[PDB]
Design a protein around this nucleic acid. Structure first.
Ligand code: DLU
Ligand code: DLU
Ligand code: MG
Ligand code: MG
Ligand code: MG
Ligand code: MG
Ligand code: NH4
Ligand code: NH4
Ligand code: ZN
Ligand code: ZN
Lengths: 368, 184, 368, 184
DNA sequence: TGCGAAATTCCATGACA
DNA sequence: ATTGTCATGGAATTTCGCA
DNA sequence: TGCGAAATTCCATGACA
DNA sequence: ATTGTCATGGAATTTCGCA
């Protein structure tokens, strides 16, 4: 108010206000002659309201807010007062987009053995075929070997029936899935516990995390499409064909088919590899164990130039998953509790629940 | 000659009629010759059709060079022959009234019938749900002749379900008495 | 057949077949002992069928198809016969994804004057507000100045009513729009002809092309969202507020608001710029003409390392716009008739119609 | 003193009653003082409400420092005063029975009434649709005093609709005779 | 001990809602 | 309490056939 | 003729279905 | 017969205030 600005008018120096400029009174207001013209110096007690009025015209960010203010006013360190308000504006914080990229992806170790980890997922709905609409896809992490089950719904109940059939063969240590209703039900949890199977869950709304199976989904749909060209979409009877076709397709980077990785020898399918015809099975399994440990594994790519990586205590915001029309795309700020890895965190929302989330569904809250 | 391998030969046979379970009456039994690995499929009948239907499931996972069977009707029909020819599978039959496989397969088949009988007492009607557990038991069962289970021989790894108990498989005096009550 | 391969068995050299290897007969088939093992050399007359059988197992590409064939066979220049079949396989051609990026975007010249070019578009549907569901957005290309009209449908009829109101002010040389039904109707065409307005159309399914307005859509929805936080979505009464708010917001790269670019002087809105208070209007308009010609203009970014740019006569394929479930994502190959610019082409489809399309909705047909 | 500018002052007035057109009876007329730029708005009545409604449209495009009017009820109501105060618009009234603007505005308003009358003959009921074309005519009309049209003065460019014909604006003997038939 | 061509490996691109 | 993936087909690089 | 801090400019990021 | 755009907020760079 009055105080600070009074000493200025009589010609005494105040820190912040450069001395080489002529400060004066006119129309009952303190003014100054700056290169760009003559501006009003409002009293500090008025400044917050001004920044706010300017910001609120269209809820603009730093520079567009400054440009408005500078039209009429000058004071020391204007942007600091602008940034202060941006950091407290709930509407801007939850609505604006982020302009910092996630840090580079992890390439998790390939499971060591077949049956160490299954990845499961649904595809659908699809055009009805024999009364069926969905496909349960099961991908063994180590081998890529895949099982396909037609279903009527992406239900727990259908999942259980299909996996009872599959686990006839072998029981996996782990089953990884997204947070679909089928997989997160208590009925499914009991079914896993009963068999000593650990359920691992993707952070929510982050299909990258089920990448092994999502990627196989693509191959499945792609081959289905080709086989169905020019015909009606009768996919039911093609599932077994596709399964067999994909489990016996080479991955060019690996030089092995998933069936080869699982069994160490082709069955009686076309163009069966005949290279181990003179080895004993035991010799064959020995070469297989070897092959399995020396497979190509990709590494974390370079960070983009403007990436952020999370830190315990940071204010961050979770992406709203299914935002309504004209509603914010971000939740209110929350706090990073633990950095599980550089791409995964536990946050305390404002409620507050502990939530485990992908960095991809997060932004660092702007302006601290 | 070349060493015996998985998928070289599948031995198939039916078992039943059994008491009904979820509408099913038989089990098609498939044993891999080299590994002893067993696959079981419930059917409503020992027909060519039910055989084709079940083997379609199995052959979408692995196709054998040779299928071996006795001369049951389901297996000697010209349909089943057509089915096999389409998949490049050679069919092979034992001589009538003179069944043959290998010691390994005979032993395995004996185990299957014995393990089954042990379980359809007290619950003659609930065997449908037990087929998964039966197969896991059979496939994680130590082979005296080889040093390895069928699981180990098919996949080249230990299983996450080792059946560490070499089980009784024999009927206890209680099970003998209540099995003579279902018949007599 | 027999011929070619006979001279080989007796020991005479044939071009293609390396001489340092032992070629022979066994089981009634020509064979050879290659480092990887012993392979069958089928007669040329058999080779096409083999490549085809291998390819058809799962409709694999070059290497995955080769890897199957190499299991059993060897012949000279195997990949050439594989690539030959990939180039003739209708199912692979129309189903596979492209792995070549579009060349870098054009940054078209900013229109020289206000009213040279309007960009128009619809937003919606939105939550019903006073019976209204859509917004017609009109963006002047030079200035960014924007007009907003609430409508009940994205109809020609509603478009005409709104533009009759707008053109009261001034008539633009050009109106650019996408291919929505509202804008491509003959009724709308007559309405433009009547006023000497030229209708320019985006290549289809390429909203980049309406970028000026699409980008303003984002600002509109964003400000609407902020204003509606915590309240029901009564957007109707906010349109005028948003319009005014956005037309008076600074673009930080330009240092001007769209209203300033249109009029060369702020109206009586908050924080009006007062810098030309002593100039005559004529002097003011002179500075404006100047400001307008010297605005920042971005340039074409660097090409990505694996871009393709189109060439007259090339086989290319148009992206299916709304592909059904399990149906190919690409049309049959078509031919580039004319390269309008490096990002836009006329193609002759197989029907054949002339179509003008974005390179972004094209892939170069693989394997020539 | 500082040179006159667009948005410095808007002169507003009503015209009517007119014959009905799409349910409308009046035109609110807004003229920018510095440029002579005209905006027309159809209303159902000369009320404060219809004025606020039309000016809301205009003030979502540009806000004047000052609105000038005569002392019509619509403009002197305390509602209209509240409306203006909210937008920081100073209100300014001419003295009763003594209207005043500037030569430019007077001339412009004369043109408006004359251009309108010329068009509501033969089609007294179709003026609603003609308001767009009326405004374009008026705003691309050369100013004898300044060297420039209102369009040119507001936007700093030539228009894509130059009304190259300095038009008759006077009634032809046919239009005079059939205008004395609608009344008498 | 080096050439031209073929084979193999590299890797950006895009798609699994 | 968890984490991207991998077929694809031009281009780049390596290996082959020969001398 | 050069320092520390403030101001301004740069520009990757993401979103307009 | 056509064609991306531009608000945003940290970081990089330039300019200011002073000497
Ligand atoms: C109702 C459940 C629980 C909540 O989430 C939804 C929606 N969802 C979405 C995708 C999806 O967006 N796939 C596209 C994709 C995008 C990027 C990438 F790297 C990999 C990808 F596969 C799925 O795949 C998926 O399975 C689900 C699903 O199951 N649910
Ligand atoms: C029925 C009409 C005719 C046929 O096309 C549809 C669908 N469409 C889609 C988008 C859209 O995808 N916007 C997102 C976007 C994506 C990338 C980018 F660079 C810019 C962007 F705005 C539109 O904006 C749009 O107006 C329409 C529309 O009008 N139509
Ligand atoms: Mg899922
Ligand atoms: Mg998925
Ligand atoms: Mg559109
Ligand atoms: Mg759009
Ligand atoms: N890992
Ligand atoms: N251009
Ligand atoms: Zn805000
Ligand atoms: Zn194909």
């Amino acid at each position: 108010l009055d105080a600070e600005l009074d000493q200025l008018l009589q010609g005494h120096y105040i820190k912040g206000y450069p001395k080489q400029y002529t400060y004066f009174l006119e129309d009952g207001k303190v003014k100054v002659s700056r290169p760009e013209g003559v501006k009003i110096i409002p009293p500090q007690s008025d400044r917050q309201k001004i920044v706010l009025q300017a910001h609120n015209l269209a809820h603009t960010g730093r520079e567009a807010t400054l440009l408005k203010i500078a039209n009429l006013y000058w004071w020391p360190n204007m942007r600091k007062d602008v940034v202060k308000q941006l950091g407290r504006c709930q509407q801007c914080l939850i609505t604006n987009a982020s302009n910092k990229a996630s840090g580079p992806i992890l390439r998790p170790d390939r499971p060591q053995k077949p049956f160490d980890k299954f990845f499961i997922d649904y595809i659908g709905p699809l055009p009805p075929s024999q009364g069926y609409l969905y496909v349960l896809v099961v991908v063994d992490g180590m081998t890529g070997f895949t099982w396909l089950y037609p279903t009527k719904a992406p239900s727990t109940s259908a999942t259980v029936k299909s996996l009872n059939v599959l686990t006839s063969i072998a029981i996996p240590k782990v089953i990884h899935s997204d947070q679909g209703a089928a997989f997160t039900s208590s009925t499914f949890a009991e079914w896993a516990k009963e068999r000593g199977i650990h359920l691992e869950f993707s952070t929510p709304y982050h299909p990258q995390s089920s990448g092994k199976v999502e990627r196989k989904n693509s191959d499945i749909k792609r081959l289905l499409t080709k086989l169905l060209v020019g015909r009606p979409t009768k996919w039911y009877d093609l599932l077994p064909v596709v399964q067999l076709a994909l489990n016996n397709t080479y991955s060019p980077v690996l030089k092995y088919t998933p069936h080869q990785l699982l069994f160490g020898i082709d069955s009686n399918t076309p163009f069966a590899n005949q290279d181990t015809l003179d080895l004993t099975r035991e010799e064959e399994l020995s070469l297989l164990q070897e092959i399995r440990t020396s497979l190509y594994h990709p590494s974390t790519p370079p960070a983009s130039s403007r990436s952020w990586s999370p830190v315990v205590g940071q204010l961050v915001q979770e992406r709203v998953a299914r935002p309504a029309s004209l509603r914010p795309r971000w939740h209110k700020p929350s706090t990073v509790l633990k950095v599980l890895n550089p791409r995964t965190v536990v946050i305390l929302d404002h409620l507050g629940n502990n939530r485990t989330v992908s960095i991809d569904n997060l932004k660092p809250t702007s302006h601290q | 000659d070349r060493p015996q391998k998985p998928f070289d030969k599948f031995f198939i046979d039916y078992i039943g009629p059994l008491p009904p379970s979820q509408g099913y009456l038989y089990v098609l039994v498939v044993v891999d010759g080299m590994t002893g690995f067993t696959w079981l499929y419930p059917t409503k009948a020992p027909s060519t059709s039910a055989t084709v239907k079940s083997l379609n499931v199995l052959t979408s996972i692995a196709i054998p060079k040779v299928i071996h069977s006795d001369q049951g009707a389901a297996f000697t029909s010209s349909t089943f022959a057509e089915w096999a020819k389409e998949r490049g599978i050679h069919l092979e039959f034992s001589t009538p009234y003179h069944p043959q496989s290998s010691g390994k397969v005979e032993r395995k088949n004996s185990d299957i019938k014995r393990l089954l009988t042990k379980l359809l007492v007290g619950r003659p009607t609930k065997w449908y749900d037990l087929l998964p557990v039966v197969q896991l038991a059979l496939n994680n069962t130590y082979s005296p002749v080889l040093k390895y289970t069928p699981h180990q021989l098919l996949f080249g790894i230990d299983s996450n379900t080792p059946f560490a108990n070499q089980d009784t498989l024999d009927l206890t005096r209680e099970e003998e008495l209540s099995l003579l009550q279902e018949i007599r």
